[PDB]
């Protein structure tokens, strides 16, 4: 949301749910943000991670986990 | 409604009430000069009896 020349007007940007790509509003208290930690060789290790967020619209279906598998198959660390 | 309601009492309270004259007072301003007074006395309920 720009105007005239630069200056991103408005306050903040709503997070976009990974599973549906649909924006999470202010008062969705059923929203989630997972952190999943990486590992080095013979790890061990955390602190570097893949963040991922999903809305309460997706969760109350029961389709949270099936989509969250897809979002960490493409990263590498599952093999479904 | 019934037609035979009597017309004797018509003009009871207009005739009953005690007459009294209006007091002589100094005239209010009119037009623009009235809207001057109404502007000032608000910004420096409106009718508050004892």
């Amino acid at each position: 949301m720009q105007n005239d020349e630069g200056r991103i007007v408005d306050l903040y940007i709503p997070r976009k749910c990974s599973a549906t790509g649909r924006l999470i509003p202010a008062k969705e208290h059923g929203a989630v943000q997972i952190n999943v930690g990486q590992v080095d060789e013979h790890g061990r290790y955390t602190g570097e991670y893949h963040a991922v967020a999903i809305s309460g619209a997706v969760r109350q279906r029961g389709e949270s986990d099936a989509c969250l598998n897809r979002l960490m198959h493409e990263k590498g660390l599952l093999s479904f | 409604g019934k037609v035979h309601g009597s017309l004797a009492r018509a003009g009871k309270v207009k005739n009953q009430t005690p007459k009294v004259a209006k007091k002589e007072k100094k005239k209010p301003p009119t037009g623009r000069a009235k809207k001057r007074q109404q502007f000032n006395r608000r910004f420096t309920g409106p009718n508050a009896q004892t």
Partner: protein, 225 residues
């Protein structure tokens, strides 16, 4: 007045002054449970500007039980600071002033940010509902439409106030259904404004950054009591 003892993770963080402003809370979508959190951000003079509260309506409610009737008063209160922040709250109580206290507390707790747009050309601070946004509550459809600048607000007097407390300068209201019930009408108007951020434009097609939460970054403070 007064030094409240913060309860919960959010309460502790705000008093210390770690979280900067409420857009950080609204991003990660965290429930503000005490009103003392939101009292902190809108400080007098400092707030620019302080939150303003107006009492929309007072309605006597009666329950017929046994001998006699018991009447309680339900107080609708909207509250907002012009510049995108608005809220809407209700409470009932046996006396009138005791309802309005708790109604203002509930109004602050249900405080929601409102994005705002330009109607065609886009110069010099936004002034409108950014698209045609509907809201419903209990057989009261309300539809807010962008208007050109200087249009002002077109709607019911009740409509003018709680769009006024958002900061929306221009509108075209429609209103189907029984607008006589002001309890439903305010909720219908309010839940329209709540959905403004929820609606996805081509301006927000870019994939998100994912910053750390205020719960994450100030975890080590929240270890100790």
């Amino acid at each position: 007045l007064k030094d409240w003892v913060p309860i919960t993770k959010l309460g502790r963080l705000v008093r210390d002054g770690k979280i900067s402003s409420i857009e950080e809370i609204y991003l990660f979508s965290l429930p503000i449970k005490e009103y003392q959190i939101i009292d902190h951000f809108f400080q007098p003079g400092n707030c620019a500007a302080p939150l303003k509260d107006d009492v929309m309506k007072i309605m006597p409610v009666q329950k017929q039980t046994r001998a006699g009737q018991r009447t309680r008063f339900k107080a609708f209160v909207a509250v907002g600071d012009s510049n995108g922040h608005c809220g809407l709250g209700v409470k009932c109580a046996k006396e009138v002033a005791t309802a309005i206290r708790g109604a203002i507390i509930a109004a602050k707790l249900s405080l929601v940010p409102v994005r705002r747009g330009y109607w065609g050309n886009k110069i010099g601070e936004p002034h409108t509902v950014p698209m045609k946004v509907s809201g419903r509550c209990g057989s009261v459809r309300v539809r807010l439409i962008p208007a050109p600048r200087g249009t002002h607000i077109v709607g019911a007097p009740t409509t003018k106030k709680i769009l006024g407390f958002a900061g929306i300068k221009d509108c075209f209201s429609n209103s189907k259904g029984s607008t006589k019930t002001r309890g439903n009408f305010m909720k219908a108007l309010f839940d329209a404004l709540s959905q403004t951020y929820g609606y996805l434009t081509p301006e927000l097609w870019t994939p998100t950054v994912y910053t750390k939460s205020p719960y994450q970054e100030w975890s080590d403070y929240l270890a100790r009591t």
